[PDB]
Design a protein around this ligand. Structure first.
Ligand SMILES: [Cl-]
Length: 275
């Protein structure tokens, strides 16, 4: 029953809006885990389990996406404390988050960006198929398993149940948010997710995000400061179309000429990561 007997807690990995995240190991089988604490007072979006138990919405969303194998970090267990919730999540080892990876290594070769972007797309499709919208897709919320070449999506703390009607709330990362949110405080889930995927793809191939200020986001003029292929540029510009209805569907992204002949995760690691 006690989390403290069930888990050996290691160092703090970081903290922020998502709470405080620690490295841990599951005592029974030495499974590497991440242990995430959030103060109850600090929780904005609440949900409830089938049994009517009151939980953070994050737990509800995680349960929906954690069935079977996927490119999403799975929730293994969770605990309620008097003043907080503690979530036990998978932890890849060895691992590096994609923000850190890009910061250290610079712009990614297109072959590598293709492999990573494809995997992110498959993970996002998985979320949507499970009825969950992440709402904070960005480099820092993607973990790279450096040995397996697998990417894993993290931090559902800004997410929502996926719906076909308009969203009028948002607490994700502003520089990845779409022009319709900035201008009108309104967006739809899939088309907003595609915008954020455009920002991410640009970040991968350029080594930095395309827009900093609101006026740039709504201007949507995409300038490339690095050499990027015409097909890649086309896909980015399409994802970053100003009118949400002008953006590609997930099918249209994965059928784009830039996205053909993707490497497998293992070969991605052998070529680009082992070192
Ligand atoms: Cl917290």
């Amino acid at each position: 029953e006690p989390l403290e007997s069930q888990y050996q807690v290691g160092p703090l990995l970081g903290s922020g809006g998502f709470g405080s995240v620690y490295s841990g190991i599951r005592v029974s089988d030495n499974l590497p885990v991440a242990i995430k604490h959030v103060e109850k007072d600090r929780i904005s979006d609440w949900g409830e389990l089938p049994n009517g138990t009151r939980v953070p919405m994050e737990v509800v969303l995680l349960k929906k996406v954690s069935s079977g194998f996927s490119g999403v970090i799975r929730l293994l267990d969770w605990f309620e404390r008097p003043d907080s919730f503690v979530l036990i999540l998978e932890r890849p080892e060895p691992v590096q988050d994609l923000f850190d990876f890009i910061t250290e290594r610079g712009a990614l070769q297109e072959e590598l960006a293709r492999s990573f972007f494809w995997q992110v797309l498959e993970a996002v499709r998985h979320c949507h198929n499970c009825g969950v919208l992440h709402r904070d897709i960005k480099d820092e919320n993607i973990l790279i398993d450096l040995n397996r070449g697998e990417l894993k999506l993290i931090d559902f703390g800004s997410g929502a149940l996926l719906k076909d009607t308009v969203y009028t709330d948002f607490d994700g990362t502003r520089v990845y948010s779409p022009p319709e949110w900035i201008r009108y405080h309104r967006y739809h889930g899939r088309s907003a997710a595609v915008w954020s995927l455009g920002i991410l793809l640009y970040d991968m191939v350029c080594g930095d995000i395309p827009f900093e200020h609101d006026e740039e986001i709504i201007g949507g003029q995409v300038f490339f400061r690095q050499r990027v292929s015409s097909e890649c540029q086309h896909l980015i510009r399409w994802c970053l179309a100003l009118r949400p209805s002008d953006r590609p569907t997930f099918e249209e992204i994965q059928n784009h000429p830039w996205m053909q002949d993707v490497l497998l995760p293992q070969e991605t690691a052998e070529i680009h990561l082992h070192s």
